[PDB]
Amino acid sequence: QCCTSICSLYQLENYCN
Amino acid sequence: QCCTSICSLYQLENYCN
Amino acid sequence: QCCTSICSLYQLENYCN
Amino acid sequence: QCCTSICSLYQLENYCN
Amino acid sequence: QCCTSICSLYQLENYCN
Amino acid sequence: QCCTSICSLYQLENYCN
Amino acid sequence: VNQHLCGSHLVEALYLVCGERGFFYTPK
Amino acid sequence: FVNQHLCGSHLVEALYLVCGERGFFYTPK
Amino acid sequence: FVNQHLCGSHLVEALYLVCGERGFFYTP
Amino acid sequence: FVNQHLCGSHLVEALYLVCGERGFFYTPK
Amino acid sequence: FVNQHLCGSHLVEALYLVCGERGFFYTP
Amino acid sequence: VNQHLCGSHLVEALYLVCGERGFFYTPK
Ligand SMILES: Oc1cccc(O)c1
Ligand SMILES: Oc1cccc(O)c1
Ligand SMILES: Oc1cccc(O)c1
Ligand SMILES: Oc1cccc(O)c1
Ligand SMILES: Oc1cccc(O)c1
Ligand SMILES: Oc1cccc(O)c1
Ligand SMILES: [Cl-]
Ligand SMILES: [Cl-]
Ligand SMILES: [Zn+2]
Ligand SMILES: [Zn+2]
């Protein structure tokens, strides 16, 4: 989860539809 | 329909979960 | 207020002219 | 003005209180 | 150049240091 | 030196090309 | 290129309007 | 800790959305 | 919750960029 | 063609940077 | 130049994200 | 996580301050 630690492009991919 | 006109905050509520 | 305690959009309406 | 002709930051200083 | 046409992640890579 | 204080526009000019 | 640019403003607005509910976004 | 300067930028964006054409009289940091 | 609120604004902008045409599903 | 609504959001961000704590009295779209 | 000016604001935000720690060199 | 978040505001400011000159950005 992306406001505790920073998320990479790859972790961010998981929100995409 | 929102890039080519200012949608009302009422209307944008349609995108909410 | 709002940079110490979170303010909703309804709350921010009280600062509009 | 500024959304038809580009305004520099020096120019925008004229709208500060 | 990225304001005439849109640039992908890959075209954007080229500005990086 | 700018995340942990507001740099002057004078100071930020140091990052310009 | 306004389509790409307008989407970025739309998702911010949605973020603000939807609050804890979140939202679902797609172009087209 | 909240950076008030940075929080202020977001608050002004929120105010712009909320108040539209009539604008806002104060930025409530 | 002010910090989480500011971060989320940043997060939805990144998602918008990362996800391109597929769009995305945001929940806090 | 310039979207004035969207341009306005950028102008308010610029004004926030330029005017700092004293704020701005008008958004010159 | 107003449109190119608005697009560039968006562009530097994307570059910031794409480039991560490497940073970037921006020219209009 | 403020470091990541503050960088995004810094690059916008730099974009605005530097104008046609551009700028050079790195973290650290
Ligand atoms: O974890 C995060 C939060 C916000 C933006 C981002 O790129 C990553
Ligand atoms: O219809 C819209 C589009 C983009 C931003 C906004 O606040 C409203
Ligand atoms: O309390 C706040 C602070 C910043 C932006 C916002 O929408 C609300
Ligand atoms: O003329 C303009 C319009 C929008 C933002 C800005 O910095 C200048
Ligand atoms: O060509 C562009 C311009 C601005 C943002 C972006 O992601 C791509
Ligand atoms: O020193 C800074 C940092 C971030 C934004 C800004 O306008 C100034
Ligand atoms: Cl725009
Ligand atoms: Cl922030
Ligand atoms: Zn824009
Ligand atoms: Zn921020």
Side-chain angles (χ1 to χ4, degrees), chain A residues 4-15:
Chain A
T4 287
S5 62
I6 186 195
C7 288
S8 51
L9 178 225
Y10 302 96
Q11 269 164 324
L12 293 174
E13 101 205 307
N14 266 229
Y15 280 90

Tab-separated table of all heavy atoms in Angstrom, chain A residues 4-15:
chain	number	residue	atom	x	y	z
A	4	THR	N	2.206	4.275	2.854
A	4	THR	CA	3.102	3.916	3.967
A	4	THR	C	4.519	3.894	3.425
A	4	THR	O	5.344	4.713	3.796
A	4	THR	CB	2.745	2.554	4.593
A	4	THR	OG1	1.544	2.686	5.357
A	4	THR	CG2	3.861	2.065	5.506
A	5	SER	N	4.781	2.961	2.526
A	5	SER	CA	6.012	2.935	1.757
A	5	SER	C	5.702	3.426	0.345
A	5	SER	O	4.537	3.431	-0.058
A	5	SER	CB	6.542	1.498	1.696
A	5	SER	OG	5.607	0.654	1.033
A	6	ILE	N	6.740	3.816	-0.401
A	6	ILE	CA	6.611	4.197	-1.823
A	6	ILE	C	6.492	2.972	-2.747
A	6	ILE	O	7.198	1.970	-2.570
A	6	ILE	CB	7.807	5.072	-2.309
A	6	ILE	CG1	7.587	5.582	-3.750
A	6	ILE	CG2	9.116	4.317	-2.243
A	6	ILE	CD1	8.865	6.135	-4.390
A	7	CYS	N	5.619	3.076	-3.751
A	7	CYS	CA	5.388	1.976	-4.675
A	7	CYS	C	6.100	2.269	-5.971
A	7	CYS	O	6.097	3.387	-6.436
A	7	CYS	CB	3.897	1.784	-4.937
A	7	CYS	SG	2.972	1.082	-3.560
A	8	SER	N	6.696	1.240	-6.554
A	8	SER	CA	7.349	1.321	-7.844
A	8	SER	C	6.296	1.294	-8.935
A	8	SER	O	5.123	1.066	-8.661
A	8	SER	CB	8.276	0.108	-8.033
A	8	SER	OG	7.579	-1.110	-7.773
A	9	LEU	N	6.735	1.493	-10.177
A	9	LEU	CA	5.884	1.345	-11.374
A	9	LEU	C	5.190	-0.020	-11.334
A	9	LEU	O	4.028	-0.164	-11.693
A	9	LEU	CB	6.782	1.418	-12.629
A	9	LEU	CG	6.314	1.266	-14.090
A	9	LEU	CD1	7.267	0.343	-14.874
A	9	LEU	CD2	4.889	0.737	-14.227
A	10	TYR	N	5.935	-1.029	-10.893
A	10	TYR	CA	5.448	-2.384	-10.920
A	10	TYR	C	4.366	-2.620	-9.878
A	10	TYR	O	3.380	-3.257	-10.181
A	10	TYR	CB	6.607	-3.367	-10.738
A	10	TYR	CG	7.670	-3.195	-11.791
A	10	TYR	CD1	8.796	-2.414	-11.546
A	10	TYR	CD2	7.537	-3.776	-13.043
A	10	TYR	CE1	9.800	-2.249	-12.507
A	10	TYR	CE2	8.537	-3.618	-14.027
A	10	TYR	CZ	9.669	-2.849	-13.747
A	10	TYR	OH	10.669	-2.685	-14.695
A	11	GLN	N	4.548	-2.119	-8.658
A	11	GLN	CA	3.482	-2.168	-7.645
A	11	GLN	C	2.258	-1.356	-8.069
A	11	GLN	O	1.135	-1.760	-7.805
A	11	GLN	CB	3.994	-1.688	-6.280
A	11	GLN	CG	4.541	-2.795	-5.396
A	11	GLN	CD	5.390	-2.280	-4.225
A	11	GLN	OE1	6.123	-1.290	-4.348
A	11	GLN	NE2	5.320	-2.986	-3.094
A	12	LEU	N	2.481	-0.225	-8.740
A	12	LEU	CA	1.377	0.613	-9.212
A	12	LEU	C	0.543	-0.121	-10.289
A	12	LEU	O	-0.657	0.096	-10.360
A	12	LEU	CB	1.902	1.919	-9.770
A	12	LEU	CG	2.557	2.932	-8.819
A	12	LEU	CD1	3.108	4.071	-9.686
A	12	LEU	CD2	1.581	3.493	-7.777
A	13	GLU	N	1.172	-0.986	-11.095
A	13	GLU	CA	0.513	-1.790	-12.154
A	13	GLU	C	-0.736	-2.515	-11.646
A	13	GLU	O	-1.677	-2.797	-12.385
A	13	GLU	CB	1.506	-2.839	-12.748
A	13	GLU	CG	1.329	-4.292	-12.224
A	13	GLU	CD	2.582	-5.183	-12.299
A	13	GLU	OE1	3.209	-5.314	-13.369
A	13	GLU	OE2	2.924	-5.776	-11.261
A	14	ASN	N	-0.703	-2.866	-10.370
A	14	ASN	CA	-1.757	-3.657	-9.779
A	14	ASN	C	-3.106	-2.911	-9.615
A	14	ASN	O	-4.166	-3.548	-9.515
A	14	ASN	CB	-1.251	-4.322	-8.480
A	14	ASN	CG	-0.698	-5.758	-8.711
A	14	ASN	OD1	-1.067	-6.693	-7.998
A	14	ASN	ND2	0.143	-5.930	-9.731
A	15	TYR	N	-3.095	-1.577	-9.613
A	15	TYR	CA	-4.344	-0.842	-9.556
A	15	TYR	C	-5.019	-0.767	-10.949
A	15	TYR	O	-6.198	-0.425	-11.049
A	15	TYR	CB	-4.118	0.596	-9.057
A	15	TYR	CG	-3.964	0.818	-7.557
A	15	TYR	CD1	-2.713	0.771	-6.955
A	15	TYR	CD2	-5.071	1.134	-6.763
A	15	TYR	CE1	-2.566	1.011	-5.586
A	15	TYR	CE2	-4.943	1.374	-5.393
A	15	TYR	CZ	-3.682	1.320	-4.810
A	15	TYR	OH	-3.537	1.560	-3.453
